[PDB]
Design a protein around this ligand. Structure first.
Ligand SMILES: O=C(CO)[C@@H](O)[C@H](O)[C@H](O)CO
Ligand SMILES: O=C(CO)[C@@H](O)[C@H](O)[C@H](O)CO
Ligand SMILES: OC[C@@]1(O)OC[C@@H](O)[C@@H](O)[C@@H]1O
Ligand SMILES: [Mg+2]
Ligand SMILES: [Mg+2]
Ligand SMILES: [Mn+2]
Ligand SMILES: [Mn+2]
Lengths: 292, 286
């Protein structure tokens, strides 16, 4: 395991649908402006990233970076097609290389399967291929001081693991020093037996957090029991990344907005949403955790 | 409109993945033994139901029936192609006919679009075609003293209506007295600003309720705020069908279970789940 610190992230996709020169600048400037410690860069296509330009921008804004992605049907490491698993391996190595180049230490999100609605349940073949892919990725990332955090998502976005407990069982199979659970309040709201159970069960194996409202709009305008979730995080003395995310159909790649089934926009202004979200998060977890 | 009474139902998929002679008996006997007033039959293929056998079982067990379904790509009444809308109209008429023969008064669920993940956002044309289809369905059902209840479901299951407010707006355009809102606590848990707003807004227009936990397993073992929901039902003095709805990966209808992404075995004992669900509901809304 590589060091984790309590730090707050803005998801790049809150501001920008791509990583063009303008997209990269807009998103980094947005996260910085809202008072975030880091930007979570979406590496769904890590060959699109101008790494030299991106590091220049991170320096310009004195902002740190972590990365998340979801695989696609063409790169699905669950695939019963060995060539597709290998294409996933290749995409994950490239994402790791980009994250490494930017001084980042966390690769998280749906890195263990294709993000989206599977037409049927996973076989132990899908599960075995995913675990082995996450072992090869963990081993590749380990030389680069990078932790991988496997994001548990709801039934409509994966068939592999939908609860923290399923995530921990999967990680028992991965059995790598730098592999962690990643929990997301939006997904937890659907799948979990309360918001505290998987956090308390995970303890030190919780490596990454996403904050989203039940409908992925403004924090506190939906059904997520944030009070319960953040009470659990405080109990385990969680000192790692916490990213705010939401997905506007006016900003994101139609590929993603259609996969996430974003049919209505709950907000217009990236800056207002992200600023209010961090205020809300720091109200729940505190300004800081520094003790004399 | 045909009267609504406070009655408690169990969804067929609590007991049975099909409506074979064996599946029908198992579901109807299960609902009767748990103490439900009615079984909610999943009529995704209303041509498959042996109506004469089902009537015999309902009478044998002294159990009433309502029906729910989802349309598919083949029957999607939001389609811009009249050939697909026509097939949807036909399936909805057949479902109404089966419900009539079984003495049921409620056709509910995702009757206004294909159940599942749309590849992109709905056009005003998709919406207008669905409204017109529900006008034709309402008119057909009205002749048979059958109410239709349009079920608001989450973003991954429709692109037409994901909130009670969107539901009420759609019904304003349908403008039929036997067309009602159908709310489901599982779907509300995702899409709604709390569990009260949509219920209070709907009032007399709320015609059918589904009680589902956040993960669709045992009631009271998830994130659904049932206290706020049932408080809102009391506020509007709701007297209508209340169905317990639950899905496990070990009781499967190959279409419906996969469409709903039921990946987990959240229960194995149907009788235990259904008995405890009915007690849970009656404790909160006797
Ligand atoms: O929760 C989600 C998707 O519902 C995002 O965090 C997603 O996993 C993606 O990896 C972000 O880049
Ligand atoms: O909530 C749902 C779908 O998520 C059910 O009400 C569905 O319409 C019914 O199972 C059809 O039989
Ligand atoms: O608790 C984390 C935090 O508030 O600690 C003090 C500063 O390092 C901040 O940038 C940081 O977000
Ligand atoms: Mg502003
Ligand atoms: Mg809740
Ligand atoms: Mn997330
Ligand atoms: Mn339902």
């Amino acid at each position: 395991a590589f060091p984790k610190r309590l730090e707050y992230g803005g998801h790049a996709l809150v501001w920008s649908g791509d990583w063009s020169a303008a997209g990269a600048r807009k998103a980094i400037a947005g996260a910085a402006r809202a008072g975030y410690d880091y930007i979570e860069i979406a590496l769904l296509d890590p060959w699109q990233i101008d790494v030299a330009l991106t590091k220049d921008l991170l320096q310009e804004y004195n902002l740190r970076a972590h990365a998340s992605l979801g695989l696609s049907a063409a790169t699905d490491v669950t695939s019963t097609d060995p060539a597709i698993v290998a294409k996933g391996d290749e995409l994950l190595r490239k994402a790791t290389d980009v994250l490494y180049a930017l001084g980042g230490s966390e690769l998280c999100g749906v890195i263990y399967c294709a993000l989206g609605k599977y037409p049927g349940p996973a076989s132990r073949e899908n599960r075995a291929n995913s675990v082995a892919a996450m072992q090869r990725l963990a081993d590749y990332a380990a030389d680069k001081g990078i932790n991988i955090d496997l994001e548990v998502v709801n039934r409509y976005e994966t068939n592999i693991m939908n609860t923290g407990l399923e995530g921990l069982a999967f990680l028992d199979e991965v059995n790598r020093p730098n592999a962690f659970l990643h929990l997301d309040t939006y997904h937890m709201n659907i799948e979990e037996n309360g918001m505290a159970k998987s956090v308390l069960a995970a303890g030190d194996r919780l490596g990454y957090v996403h904050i989203g409202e039940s409908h992925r709009g403004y924090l506190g305008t939906g059904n997520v029991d944030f009070a319960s979730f953040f009470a659990a995080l405080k109990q385990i003395d969680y000192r790692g990344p916490i990213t705010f995310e939401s997905f506007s159909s006016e900003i994101v790649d139609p590929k993603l907005s259609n996969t996430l089934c974003v049919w209505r926009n709950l907000w217009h202004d990236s800056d207002d949403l992200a600023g209010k979200a961090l205020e809300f998060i720091k109200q729940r977890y505190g300004s800081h955790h520094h003790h004399h």
